[PDB]
Every structure is written in C-alpha cells, then in structure tokens.
Coordinates of C-alpha atoms and ligand atoms in Angstrom, one line a residue:
Chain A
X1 CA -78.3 -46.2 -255.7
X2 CA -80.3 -49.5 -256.1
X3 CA -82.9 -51.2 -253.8
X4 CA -83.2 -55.1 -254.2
X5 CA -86.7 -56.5 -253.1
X6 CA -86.0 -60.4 -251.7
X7 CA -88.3 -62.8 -249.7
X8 CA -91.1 -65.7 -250.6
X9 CA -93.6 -65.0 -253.6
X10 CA -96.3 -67.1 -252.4
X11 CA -97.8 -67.0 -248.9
X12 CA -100.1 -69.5 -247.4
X13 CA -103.0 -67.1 -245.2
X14 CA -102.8 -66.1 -242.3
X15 CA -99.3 -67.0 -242.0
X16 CA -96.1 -64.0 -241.4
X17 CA -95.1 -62.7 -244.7
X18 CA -91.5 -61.5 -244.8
X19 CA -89.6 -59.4 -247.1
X20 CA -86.3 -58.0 -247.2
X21 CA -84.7 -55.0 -249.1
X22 CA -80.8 -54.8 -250.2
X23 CA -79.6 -51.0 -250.7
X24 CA -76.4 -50.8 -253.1
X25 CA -75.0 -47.5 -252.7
X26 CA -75.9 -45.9 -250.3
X27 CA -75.5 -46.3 -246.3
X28 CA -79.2 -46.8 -244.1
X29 CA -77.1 -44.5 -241.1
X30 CA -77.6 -41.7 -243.4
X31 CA -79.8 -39.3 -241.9
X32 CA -80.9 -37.6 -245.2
X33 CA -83.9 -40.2 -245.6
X34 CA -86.0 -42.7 -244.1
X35 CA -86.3 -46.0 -245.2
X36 CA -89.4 -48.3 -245.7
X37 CA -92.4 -49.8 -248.0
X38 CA -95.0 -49.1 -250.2
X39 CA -97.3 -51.9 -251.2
X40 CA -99.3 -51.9 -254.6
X41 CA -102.1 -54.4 -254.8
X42 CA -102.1 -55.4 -258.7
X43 CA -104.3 -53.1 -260.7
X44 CA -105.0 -50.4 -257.8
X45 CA -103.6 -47.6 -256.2
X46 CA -100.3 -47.0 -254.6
X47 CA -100.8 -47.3 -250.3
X48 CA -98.3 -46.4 -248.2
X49 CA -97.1 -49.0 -245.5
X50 CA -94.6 -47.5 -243.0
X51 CA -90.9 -46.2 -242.2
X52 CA -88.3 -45.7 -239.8
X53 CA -85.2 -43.9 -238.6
X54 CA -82.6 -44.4 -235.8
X55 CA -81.5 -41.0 -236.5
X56 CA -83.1 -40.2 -233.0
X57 CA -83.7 -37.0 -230.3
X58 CA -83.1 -36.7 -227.1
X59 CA -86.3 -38.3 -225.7
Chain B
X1 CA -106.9 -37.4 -252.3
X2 CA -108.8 -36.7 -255.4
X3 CA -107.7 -37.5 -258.6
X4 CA -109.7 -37.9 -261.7
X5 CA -109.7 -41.1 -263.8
X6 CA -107.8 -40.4 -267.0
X7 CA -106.6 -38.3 -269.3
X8 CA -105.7 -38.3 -273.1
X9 CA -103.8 -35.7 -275.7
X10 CA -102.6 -35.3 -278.8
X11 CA -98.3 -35.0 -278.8
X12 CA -97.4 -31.4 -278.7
X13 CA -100.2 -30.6 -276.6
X14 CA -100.4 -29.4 -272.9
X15 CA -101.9 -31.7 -270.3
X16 CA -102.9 -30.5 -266.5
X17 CA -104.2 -32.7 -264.1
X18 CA -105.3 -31.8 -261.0
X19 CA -105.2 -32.9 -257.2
X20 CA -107.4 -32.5 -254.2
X21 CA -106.9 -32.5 -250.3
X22 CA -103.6 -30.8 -250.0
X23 CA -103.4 -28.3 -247.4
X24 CA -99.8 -28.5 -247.3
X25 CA -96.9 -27.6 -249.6
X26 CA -96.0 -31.2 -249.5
X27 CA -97.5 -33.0 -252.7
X28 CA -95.7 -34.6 -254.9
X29 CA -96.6 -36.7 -258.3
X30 CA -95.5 -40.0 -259.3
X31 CA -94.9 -41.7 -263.3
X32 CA -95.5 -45.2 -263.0
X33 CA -95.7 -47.3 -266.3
X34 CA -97.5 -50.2 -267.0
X35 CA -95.2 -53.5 -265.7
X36 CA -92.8 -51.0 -264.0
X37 CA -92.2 -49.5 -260.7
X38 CA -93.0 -45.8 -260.1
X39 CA -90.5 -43.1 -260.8
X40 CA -90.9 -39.9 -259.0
X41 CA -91.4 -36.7 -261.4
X42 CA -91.6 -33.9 -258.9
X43 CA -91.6 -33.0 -255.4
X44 CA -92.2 -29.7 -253.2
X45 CA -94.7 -28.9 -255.4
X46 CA -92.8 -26.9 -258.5
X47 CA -89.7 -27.9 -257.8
X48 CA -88.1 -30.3 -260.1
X49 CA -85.7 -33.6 -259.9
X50 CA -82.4 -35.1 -261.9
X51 CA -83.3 -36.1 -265.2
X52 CA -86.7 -34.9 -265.2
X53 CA -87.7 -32.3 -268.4
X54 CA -88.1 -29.0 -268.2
X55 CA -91.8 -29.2 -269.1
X56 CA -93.0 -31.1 -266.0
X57 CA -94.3 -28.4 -263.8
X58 CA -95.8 -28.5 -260.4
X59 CA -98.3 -26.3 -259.1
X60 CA -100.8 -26.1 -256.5
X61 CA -103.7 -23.3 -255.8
X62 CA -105.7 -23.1 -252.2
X63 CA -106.4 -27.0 -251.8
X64 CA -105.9 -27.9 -255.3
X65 CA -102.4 -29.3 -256.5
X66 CA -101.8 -29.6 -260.3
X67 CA -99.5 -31.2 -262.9
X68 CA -98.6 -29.9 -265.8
X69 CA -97.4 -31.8 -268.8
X70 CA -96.4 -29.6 -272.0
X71 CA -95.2 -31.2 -275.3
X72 CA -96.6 -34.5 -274.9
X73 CA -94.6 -37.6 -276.4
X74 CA -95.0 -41.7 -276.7
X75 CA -92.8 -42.2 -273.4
X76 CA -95.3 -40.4 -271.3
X77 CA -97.7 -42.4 -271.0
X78 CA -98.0 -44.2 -267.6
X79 CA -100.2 -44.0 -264.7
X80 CA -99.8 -40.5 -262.5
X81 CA -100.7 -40.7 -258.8
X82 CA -100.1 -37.7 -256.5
X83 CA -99.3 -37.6 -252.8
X84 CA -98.5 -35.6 -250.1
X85 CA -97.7 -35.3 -246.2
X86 CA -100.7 -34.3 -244.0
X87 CA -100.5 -33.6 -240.5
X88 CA -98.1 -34.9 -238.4
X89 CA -95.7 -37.6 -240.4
X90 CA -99.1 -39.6 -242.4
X91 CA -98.6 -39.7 -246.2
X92 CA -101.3 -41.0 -248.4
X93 CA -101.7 -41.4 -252.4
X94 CA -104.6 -40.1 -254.6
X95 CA -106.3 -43.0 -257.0
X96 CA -103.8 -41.5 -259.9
X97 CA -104.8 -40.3 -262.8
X98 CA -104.0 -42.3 -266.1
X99 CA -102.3 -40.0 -269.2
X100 CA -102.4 -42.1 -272.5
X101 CA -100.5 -40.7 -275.7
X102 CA -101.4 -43.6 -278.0
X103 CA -101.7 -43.2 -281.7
X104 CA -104.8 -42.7 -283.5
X105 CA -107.6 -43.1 -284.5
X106 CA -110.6 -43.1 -282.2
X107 CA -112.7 -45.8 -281.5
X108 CA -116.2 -46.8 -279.9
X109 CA -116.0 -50.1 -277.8
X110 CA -117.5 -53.4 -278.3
X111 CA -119.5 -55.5 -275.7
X112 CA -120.1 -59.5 -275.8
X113 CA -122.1 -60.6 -273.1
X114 CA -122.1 -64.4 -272.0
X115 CA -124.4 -65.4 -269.5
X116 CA -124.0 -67.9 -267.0
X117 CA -124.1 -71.9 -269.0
X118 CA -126.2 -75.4 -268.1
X119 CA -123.0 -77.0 -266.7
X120 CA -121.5 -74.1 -264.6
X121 CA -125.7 -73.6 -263.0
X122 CA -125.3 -77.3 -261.8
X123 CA -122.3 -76.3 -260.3
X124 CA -124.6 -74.5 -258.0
X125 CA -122.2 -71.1 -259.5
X126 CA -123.3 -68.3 -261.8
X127 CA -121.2 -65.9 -263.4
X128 CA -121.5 -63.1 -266.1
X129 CA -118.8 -62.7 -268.1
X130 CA -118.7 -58.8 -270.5
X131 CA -116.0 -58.4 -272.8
X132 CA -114.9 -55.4 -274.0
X133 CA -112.4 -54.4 -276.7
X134 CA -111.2 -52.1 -279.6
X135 CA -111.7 -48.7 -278.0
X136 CA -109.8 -45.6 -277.4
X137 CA -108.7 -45.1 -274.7
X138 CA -107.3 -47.9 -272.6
X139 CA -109.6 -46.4 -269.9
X140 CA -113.4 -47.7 -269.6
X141 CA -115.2 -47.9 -266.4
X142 CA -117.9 -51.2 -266.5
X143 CA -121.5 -51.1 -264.6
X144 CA -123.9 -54.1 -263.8
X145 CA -127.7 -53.7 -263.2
X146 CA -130.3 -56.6 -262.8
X147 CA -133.5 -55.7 -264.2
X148 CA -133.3 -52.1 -263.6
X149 CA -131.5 -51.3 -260.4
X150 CA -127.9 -51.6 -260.4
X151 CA -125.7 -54.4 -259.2
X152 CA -123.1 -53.6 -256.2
X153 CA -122.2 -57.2 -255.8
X154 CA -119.8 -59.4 -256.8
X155 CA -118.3 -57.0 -259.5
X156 CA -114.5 -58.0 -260.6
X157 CA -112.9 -55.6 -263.5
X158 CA -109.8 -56.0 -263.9
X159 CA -107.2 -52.8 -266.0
X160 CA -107.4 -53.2 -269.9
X161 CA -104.3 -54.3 -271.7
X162 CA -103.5 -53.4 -275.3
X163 CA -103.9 -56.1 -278.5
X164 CA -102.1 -56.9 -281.1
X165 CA -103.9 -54.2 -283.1
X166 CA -103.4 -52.0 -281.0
X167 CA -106.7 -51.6 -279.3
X168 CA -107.0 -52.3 -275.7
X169 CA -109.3 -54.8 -274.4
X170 CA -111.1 -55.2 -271.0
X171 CA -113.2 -57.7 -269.4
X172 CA -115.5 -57.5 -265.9
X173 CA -116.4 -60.7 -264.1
X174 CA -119.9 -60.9 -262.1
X175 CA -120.0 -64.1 -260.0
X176 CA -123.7 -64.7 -258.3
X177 CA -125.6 -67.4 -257.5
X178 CA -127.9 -69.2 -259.3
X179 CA -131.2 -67.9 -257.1
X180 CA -130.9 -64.7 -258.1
X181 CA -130.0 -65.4 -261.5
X182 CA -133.7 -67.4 -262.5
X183 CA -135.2 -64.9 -260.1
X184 CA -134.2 -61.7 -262.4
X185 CA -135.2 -62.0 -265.7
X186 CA -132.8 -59.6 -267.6
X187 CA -129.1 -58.8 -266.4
X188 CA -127.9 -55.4 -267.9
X189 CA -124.1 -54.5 -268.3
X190 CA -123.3 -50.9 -268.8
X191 CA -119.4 -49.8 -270.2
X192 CA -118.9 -46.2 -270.3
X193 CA -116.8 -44.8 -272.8
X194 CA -115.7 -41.3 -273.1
X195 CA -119.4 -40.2 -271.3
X196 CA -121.1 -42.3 -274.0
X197 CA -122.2 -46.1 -272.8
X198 CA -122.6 -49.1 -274.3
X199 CA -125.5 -51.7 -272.7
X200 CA -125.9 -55.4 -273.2
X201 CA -129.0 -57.5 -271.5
X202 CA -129.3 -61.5 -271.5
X203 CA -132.0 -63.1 -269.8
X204 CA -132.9 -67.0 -269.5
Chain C
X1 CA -81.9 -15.5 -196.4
X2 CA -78.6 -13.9 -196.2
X3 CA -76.5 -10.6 -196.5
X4 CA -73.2 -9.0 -196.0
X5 CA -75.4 -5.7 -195.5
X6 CA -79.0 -6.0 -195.7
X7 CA -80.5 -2.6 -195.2
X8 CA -77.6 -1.5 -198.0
X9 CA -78.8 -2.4 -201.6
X10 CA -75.3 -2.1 -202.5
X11 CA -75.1 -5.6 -201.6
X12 CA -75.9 -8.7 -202.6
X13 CA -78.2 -11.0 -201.2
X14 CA -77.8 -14.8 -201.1
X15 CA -80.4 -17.4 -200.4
X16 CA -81.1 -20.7 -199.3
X17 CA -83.4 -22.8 -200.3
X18 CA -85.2 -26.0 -198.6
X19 CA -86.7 -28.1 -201.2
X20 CA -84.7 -28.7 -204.4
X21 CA -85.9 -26.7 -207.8
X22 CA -85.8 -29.4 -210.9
X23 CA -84.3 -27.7 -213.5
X24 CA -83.5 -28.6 -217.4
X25 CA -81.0 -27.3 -219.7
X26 CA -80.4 -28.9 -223.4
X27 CA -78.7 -28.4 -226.6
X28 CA -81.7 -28.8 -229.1
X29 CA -78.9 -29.0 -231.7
X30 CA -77.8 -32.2 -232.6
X31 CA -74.2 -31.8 -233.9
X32 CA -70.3 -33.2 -235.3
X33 CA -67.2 -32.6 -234.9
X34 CA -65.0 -31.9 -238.0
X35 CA -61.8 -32.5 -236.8
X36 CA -60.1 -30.7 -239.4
X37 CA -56.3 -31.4 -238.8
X38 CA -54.0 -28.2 -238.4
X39 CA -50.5 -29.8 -237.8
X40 CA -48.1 -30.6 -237.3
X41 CA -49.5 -32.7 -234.5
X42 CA -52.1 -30.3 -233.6
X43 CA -56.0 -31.0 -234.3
X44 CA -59.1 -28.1 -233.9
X45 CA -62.6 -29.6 -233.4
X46 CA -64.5 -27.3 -235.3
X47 CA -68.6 -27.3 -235.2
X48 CA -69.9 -29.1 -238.5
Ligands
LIG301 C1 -78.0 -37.4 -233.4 O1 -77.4 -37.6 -234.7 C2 -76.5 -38.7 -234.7 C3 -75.9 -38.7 -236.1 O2 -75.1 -37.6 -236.4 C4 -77.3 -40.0 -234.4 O3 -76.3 -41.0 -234.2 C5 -76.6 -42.2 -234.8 O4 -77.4 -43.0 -233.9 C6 -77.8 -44.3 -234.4 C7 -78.7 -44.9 -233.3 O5 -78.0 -45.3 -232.2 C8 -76.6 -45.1 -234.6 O6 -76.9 -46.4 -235.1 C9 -76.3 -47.3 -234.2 O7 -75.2 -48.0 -234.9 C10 -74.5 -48.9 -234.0 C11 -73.2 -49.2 -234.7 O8 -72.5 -48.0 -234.9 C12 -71.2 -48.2 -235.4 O9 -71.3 -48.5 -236.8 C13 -71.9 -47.4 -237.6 C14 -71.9 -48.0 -239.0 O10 -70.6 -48.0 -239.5 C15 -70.6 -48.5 -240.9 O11 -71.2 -47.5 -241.8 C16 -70.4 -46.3 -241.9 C17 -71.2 -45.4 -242.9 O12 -71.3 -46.1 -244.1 C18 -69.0 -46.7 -242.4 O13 -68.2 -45.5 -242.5 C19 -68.3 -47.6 -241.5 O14 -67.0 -48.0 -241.9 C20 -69.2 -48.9 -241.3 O15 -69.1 -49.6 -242.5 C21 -71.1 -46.1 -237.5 O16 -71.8 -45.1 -238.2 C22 -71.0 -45.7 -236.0 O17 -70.2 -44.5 -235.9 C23 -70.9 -43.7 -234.9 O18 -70.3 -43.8 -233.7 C24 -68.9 -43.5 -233.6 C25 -68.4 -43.8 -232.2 O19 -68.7 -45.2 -231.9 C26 -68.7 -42.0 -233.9 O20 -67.4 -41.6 -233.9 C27 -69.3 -41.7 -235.3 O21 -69.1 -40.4 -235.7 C28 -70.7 -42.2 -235.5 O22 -71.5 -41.3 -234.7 C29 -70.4 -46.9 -235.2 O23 -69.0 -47.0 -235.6 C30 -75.4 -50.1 -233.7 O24 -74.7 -51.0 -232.9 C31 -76.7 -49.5 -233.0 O25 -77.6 -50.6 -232.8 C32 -78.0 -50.7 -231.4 O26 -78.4 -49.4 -230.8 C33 -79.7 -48.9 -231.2 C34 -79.9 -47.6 -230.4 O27 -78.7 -46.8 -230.6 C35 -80.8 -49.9 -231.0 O28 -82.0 -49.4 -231.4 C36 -80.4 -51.2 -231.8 O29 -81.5 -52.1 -231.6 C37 -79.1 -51.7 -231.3 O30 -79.3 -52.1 -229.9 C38 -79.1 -53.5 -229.8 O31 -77.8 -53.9 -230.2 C39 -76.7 -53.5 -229.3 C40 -75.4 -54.0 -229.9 O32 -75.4 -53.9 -231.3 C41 -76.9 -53.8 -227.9 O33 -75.9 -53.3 -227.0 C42 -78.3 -53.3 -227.4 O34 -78.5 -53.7 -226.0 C43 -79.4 -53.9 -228.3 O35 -79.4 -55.3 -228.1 C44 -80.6 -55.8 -227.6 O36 -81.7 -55.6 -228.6 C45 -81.6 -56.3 -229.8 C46 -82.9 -55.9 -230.6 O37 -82.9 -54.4 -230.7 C47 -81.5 -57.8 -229.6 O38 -81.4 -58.4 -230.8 C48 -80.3 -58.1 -228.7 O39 -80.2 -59.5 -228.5 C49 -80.4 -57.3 -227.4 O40 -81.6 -57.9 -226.7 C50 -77.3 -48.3 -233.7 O41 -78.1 -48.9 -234.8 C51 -75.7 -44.4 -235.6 O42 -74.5 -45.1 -235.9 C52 -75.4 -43.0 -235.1 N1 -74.5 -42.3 -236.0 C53 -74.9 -41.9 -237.2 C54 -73.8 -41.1 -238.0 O43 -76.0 -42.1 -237.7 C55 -78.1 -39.8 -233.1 O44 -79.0 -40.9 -233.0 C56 -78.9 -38.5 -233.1 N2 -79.6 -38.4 -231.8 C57 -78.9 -38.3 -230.6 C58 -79.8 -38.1 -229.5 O45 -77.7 -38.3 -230.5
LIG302 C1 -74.3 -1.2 -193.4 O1 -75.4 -0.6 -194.1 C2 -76.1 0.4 -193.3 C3 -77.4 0.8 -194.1 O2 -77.6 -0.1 -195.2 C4 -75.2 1.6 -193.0 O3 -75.9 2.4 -192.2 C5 -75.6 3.8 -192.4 O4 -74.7 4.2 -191.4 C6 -74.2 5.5 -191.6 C7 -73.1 5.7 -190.6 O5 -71.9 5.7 -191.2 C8 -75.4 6.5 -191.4 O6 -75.0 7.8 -191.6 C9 -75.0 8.5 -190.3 O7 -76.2 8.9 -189.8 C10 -76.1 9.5 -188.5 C11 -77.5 9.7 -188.0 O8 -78.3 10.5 -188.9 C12 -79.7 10.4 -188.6 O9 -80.1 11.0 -187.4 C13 -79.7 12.3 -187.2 C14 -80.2 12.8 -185.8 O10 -81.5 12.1 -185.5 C15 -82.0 12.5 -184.3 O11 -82.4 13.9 -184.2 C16 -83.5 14.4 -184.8 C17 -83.7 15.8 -184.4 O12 -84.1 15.9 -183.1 C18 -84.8 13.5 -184.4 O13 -85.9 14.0 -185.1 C19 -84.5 12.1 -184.8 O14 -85.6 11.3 -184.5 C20 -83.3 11.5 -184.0 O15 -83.7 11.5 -182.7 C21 -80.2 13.2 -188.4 O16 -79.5 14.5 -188.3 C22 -79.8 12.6 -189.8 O17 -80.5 13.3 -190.8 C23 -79.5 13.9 -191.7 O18 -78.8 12.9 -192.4 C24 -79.6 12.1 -193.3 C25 -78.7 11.0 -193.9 O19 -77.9 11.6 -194.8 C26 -80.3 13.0 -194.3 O20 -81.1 12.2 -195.2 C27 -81.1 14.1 -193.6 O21 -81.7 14.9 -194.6 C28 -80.2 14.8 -192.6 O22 -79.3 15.6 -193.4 C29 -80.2 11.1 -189.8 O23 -81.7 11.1 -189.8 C30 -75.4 10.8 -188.7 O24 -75.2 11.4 -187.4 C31 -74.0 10.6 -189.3 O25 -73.3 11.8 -189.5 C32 -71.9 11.6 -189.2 O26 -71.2 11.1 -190.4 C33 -71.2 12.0 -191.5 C34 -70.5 11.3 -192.6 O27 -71.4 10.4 -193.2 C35 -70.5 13.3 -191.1 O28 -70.4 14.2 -192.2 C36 -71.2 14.0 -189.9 O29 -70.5 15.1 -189.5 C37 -71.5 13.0 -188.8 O30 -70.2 12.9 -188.0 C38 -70.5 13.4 -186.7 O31 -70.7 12.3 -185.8 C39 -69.5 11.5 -185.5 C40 -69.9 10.4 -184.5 O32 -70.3 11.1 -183.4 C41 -68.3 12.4 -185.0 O33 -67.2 11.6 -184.9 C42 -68.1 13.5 -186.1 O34 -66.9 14.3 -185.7 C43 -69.3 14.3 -186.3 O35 -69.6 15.0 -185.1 C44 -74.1 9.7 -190.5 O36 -74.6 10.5 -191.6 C45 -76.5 6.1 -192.3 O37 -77.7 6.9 -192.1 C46 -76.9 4.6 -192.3 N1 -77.8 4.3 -193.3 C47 -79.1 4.5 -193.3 C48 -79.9 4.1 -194.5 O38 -79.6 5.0 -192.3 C49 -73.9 1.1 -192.4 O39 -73.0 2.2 -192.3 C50 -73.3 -0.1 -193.2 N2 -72.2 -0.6 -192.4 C51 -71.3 -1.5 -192.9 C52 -70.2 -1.9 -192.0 O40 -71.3 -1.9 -194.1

C-alpha cells in the first residue's frame, strides 16, 4: 500500500489549490477505510482536513 | 487535546507521556520524525500495529490517555502527537509531545541579541533578531518583553535544528515598527531552558 | 368491520380501513452474496 501526493507546489492567494492522491495497492471501493487529508503547516501541529466514503445507507 | 511540550531519557529508560480530552476509547498516538511523514504507533488505545515493538503501550485512565515508551533507543526520537474521535465522526490532534534520545552531555543555551540597524530603521522596518544555540534539548520555548511587560506581537520562532556539533540551534524573529522601538528604551528576550531562562536586553 | 360470526369469538374478525396506514419495513443489514458454486451446473447463494 502506497499513497502518492501530486498537484502544484506553489499557489498564487486566493486562488483554488488542487491536489491529488494516487493509491498503489489497494482499491478506494473498499469499505474497510475512508479516504482523505491531513494538512501540517511547517513547524506546527498535525490538523485534520476531511474524508469520505460511497460505502453508503439506505437514506 | 493536551499534550505537554517535550520530553527527554536516557536509553534503557521508560518514558510516559500523557494525553488530555479523551472521553472516548478512541485515541490514538502518532511517531513522526523530523523531515518525514507520521507513522502511526498505536490505535484503540493498548492495542498494537504490524511492525510496532512490544514496548509501545497504550493506556488511558478517566480522561487521561497515556503512552508508554520502555527501553528507549536512537530511532525513537521523533515528534509524538495523539488523537482521537470525539462525538459524532470529528477527530482532532493534541500539540504532540516531542521525545529526544540524543547523546550527552547536557548543555545551558546561549543568547546573541541583535537589535534593529541604521539602514533597516530608514527602511521605516524594525526587527529583533535572538539567537540561540548549543543546548540540550532541541526543545526551548523563546519570550519577548519591552521594558518590563511582555511582548504578544509580532513574535516568529521557528523549531530548532541540530549543528554540526551536535547541538541544536534556534532563532526567534520580532518584526515591529520603528515608533515603538525609540519609544521603549530596553527590549528584553527571555529563552527558557529546562525551567531555567536565559535574558538579553538592548536598548538605543 | 366484518365477521363470519360476530357474537362467536371463535371467529375471526376482518376490517376495513378508509385512509391508508404508511408503513416501513427494512433490512438494516447491508449484505453479499457468496455464490459459492456446488456443481455440476448448480450454484447456492449463500449469505456473506
Ligand atoms: C452497501 O454496501 C455496498 C458494498 O458491499 C455498497 O455498494 C457500493 O456502492 C458504491 C456507491 O454507489 C459503488 O461505487 C460506485 O461504483 C460505480 C462503478 O461500479 C462498478 O465498478 C466498481 C469498481 O470495479 C473496479 O474495482 C474492483 C475492485 O478493485 C475490481 O474488482 C474491478 O475489476 C474494477 O477494476 C465495482 O466494484 C462495481 O461492482 C459492484 O456492482 C456490481 C453490479 O454492477 C456488483 O455485482 C458488485 O458486487 C459490486 O457491488 C461495478 O462493477 C460508479 O459508477 C459509481 O459512481 C456513480 O454513482 C455514485 C452513487 O452510487 C455517485 O455518487 C457518483 O457520483 C457516480 O454518479 C455519477 O456517475 C454515473 C455514471 O458513472 C451517472 O450515472 C450518475 O448520474 C452520476 O453522473 C452525474 O454526476 C457526476 C458527478 O457526480 C457528473 O460528473 C456527471 O456528468 C453526471 O452529472 C459509484 O461510485 C460501489 O461500486 C458499490 N460496491 C462496492 C463493493 O463498494 C453500497 O453503497 C452500500 N449501501 C447500500 C445502500 O447499498
Ligand atoms: C353464531 O354464533 C352465535 C353466538 O356467537 C351462536 O348462537 C348460539 O346459538 C345456539 C343455538 O345452537 C344457542 O344455544 C341454544 O340456546 C337456546 C336458548 O337458550 C337460552 O334461553 C333459554 C330459555 O330462555 C327463556 O326462558 C327463561 C325462563 O323463563 C327466561 O328467563 C328467558 O328470559 C327466556 O325467556 C334458557 O333455558 C337457556 O339457558 C340455558 O342455556 C344456557 C346456554 O348454555 C346456559 O348458560 C344456562 O345456564 C341454561 O343452562 C338460554 O338462556 C337453547 O334452547 C338451545 O338448547 C337446545 O340445543 C341444545 C344443544 O346446544 C340441546 O341440548 C337442548 O336440548 C335444546 O334443544 C331443544 O330445542 C330444540 C329446538 O326447539 C329441539 O329441536 C330439541 O329437541 C330440544 O327440545 C341451545 O342451547 C346459544 O345460546 C347461542 N349463543 C349465545 C352466546 O347465546 C350461533 O349458533 C352461531 N351460528 C352459526 C351459524 O355459526
């Protein structure tokens, strides 16, 4: 299992940043995890950002 | 969550470190080294992942979660942050503690304070520079105060990073403007190591 | 309201009703289906 971070290093402000992950090994259908992000500004603590699943209910 | 600043030991020795805010059987503790991504340690509190030593143990008391770290070697030390789940799906990380097995010996810090110079004042900009080095451990929090109350404003510090001797080395940036700099007399910088503190004072 | 005989609790009673009761029935159990192949030519869905 290997994730692959890919997408622009350098942003202009107030502009849409964009990033895009690349599993290796393992399927996203799989509904033993979720998938997201979790952003580290440099020299600070670890914040989490978000996920999601379309393993899904009934509503 | 809570976690407290740092933490040092001697290899062979036992190291717990503590967390606060978990109400839930959640928390989990991360090993992230410096220049590195994070590399989860444990998870449902005791319980224990592939790969991971015996002598990481979990544990977690009322609303206290804990760490424990027996038989401490050079490859453990990294930054150690803690998380869990709290209510209904929301996660959220403590400030990590940081665990540093470096070598000996010992060592008090050194300050060199620089204040602001004739070209940089013209620039209508002011800035204090304190540099601080050869100490033990890489973990010093840094403290400004003008006269004699403190300074909240414009502080900048920035995580040490070892030398070639094998001493870490910090430095925190206050950028001010000029006004206030003739206005004060004396600026004070305060680095506390260990409990102890160093000060340094510069005035015009 | 209706009976075969009424006075007779022996007897069922059957009604009829005017206005239409919404009712829900699910399967909070979200499920597969093995498969599993017992030939020849014959395959059992069993619950995975
Ligand atoms: C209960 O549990 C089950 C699991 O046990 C849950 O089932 C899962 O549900 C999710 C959500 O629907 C599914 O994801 C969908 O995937 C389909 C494609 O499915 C096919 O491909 C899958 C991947 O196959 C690959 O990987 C496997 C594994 O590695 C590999 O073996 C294989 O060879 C291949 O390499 C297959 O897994 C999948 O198999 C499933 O179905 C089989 C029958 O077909 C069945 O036999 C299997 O057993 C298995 O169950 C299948 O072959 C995606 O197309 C789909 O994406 C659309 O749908 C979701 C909602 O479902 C929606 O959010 C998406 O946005 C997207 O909708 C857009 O695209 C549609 C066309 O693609 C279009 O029709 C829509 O209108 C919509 O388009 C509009 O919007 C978009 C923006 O959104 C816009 O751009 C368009 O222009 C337009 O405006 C899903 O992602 C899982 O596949 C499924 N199964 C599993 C095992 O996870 C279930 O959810 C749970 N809950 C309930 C209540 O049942
Ligand atoms: C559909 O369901 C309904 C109910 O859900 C079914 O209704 C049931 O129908 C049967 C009939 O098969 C009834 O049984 C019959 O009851 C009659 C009448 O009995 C009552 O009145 C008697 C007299 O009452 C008057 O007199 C007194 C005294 O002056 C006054 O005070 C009163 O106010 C009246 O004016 C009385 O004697 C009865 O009391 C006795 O019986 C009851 C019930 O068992 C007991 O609790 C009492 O303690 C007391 O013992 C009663 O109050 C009876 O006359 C019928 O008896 C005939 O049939 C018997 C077999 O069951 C048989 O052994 C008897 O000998 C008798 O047969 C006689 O009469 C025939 C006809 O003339 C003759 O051919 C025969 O040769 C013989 O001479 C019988 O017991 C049920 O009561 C009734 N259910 C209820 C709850 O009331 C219906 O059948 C179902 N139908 C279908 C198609 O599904």
């Amino acid at each position: 299992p290997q994730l692959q971070e890919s997408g622009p290093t350098l942003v202009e402000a107030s502009e849409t940043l964009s990033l895009t992950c690349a599993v290796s090994g393992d399927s996203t259908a799989a509904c033993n995890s979720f998938w997201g992000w979790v952003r580290q500004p440099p020299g600070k603590g670890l914040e989490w950002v978000g996920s999601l699943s379309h393993c899904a209910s009934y509503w | 969550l809570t976690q407290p600043p740092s933490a040092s030991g001697s290899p062979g020795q036992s190291i717990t470190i503590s967390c606060t805010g978990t109400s839930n059987n959640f928390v989990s503790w991360y090993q992230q080294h410096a220049g590195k991504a994070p590399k989860l340690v444990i998870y449902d509190v005791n319980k224990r992942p592939s790969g991971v030593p015996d002598r990481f143990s979990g544990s977690k008391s009322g609303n206290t979660a804990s760490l424990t770290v027996s038989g401490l070697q050079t490859d453990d030390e990294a930054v150690y942050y803690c998380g869990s789940l709290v209510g209904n799906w929301d996660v959220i990380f403590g400030g990590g503690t940081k665990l540093t097995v470096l070598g000996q010996p010992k060592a008090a810090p050194s300050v060199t304070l620089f204040p602001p110079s004739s070209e940089e004042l013209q620039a209508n900009k002011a800035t204090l520079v304190c540099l601080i080095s050869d100490f033990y451990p890489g973990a010093v929090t840094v403290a400004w105060k003008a006269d004699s109350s403190p300074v909240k404003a414009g502080v900048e510090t920035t995580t040490p990073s070892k030398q070639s001797n094998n001493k870490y080395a910090a430095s925190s940036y206050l950028s001010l403007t000029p006004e206030q700099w003739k206005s004060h007399r004396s600026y004070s910088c305060q680095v506390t190591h260990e409990g102890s503190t160093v000060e340094k004072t510069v005035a015009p | 309201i209706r009976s075969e005989n009424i006075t007779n609790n022996a007897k069922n009673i059957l009604v009829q009703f005017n206005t239409p009761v919404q009712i829900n029935c699910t399967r909070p159990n979200n499920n597969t289906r093995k498969s599993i192949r017992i030939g020849p030519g014959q395959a059992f869905y069993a619950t995975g």
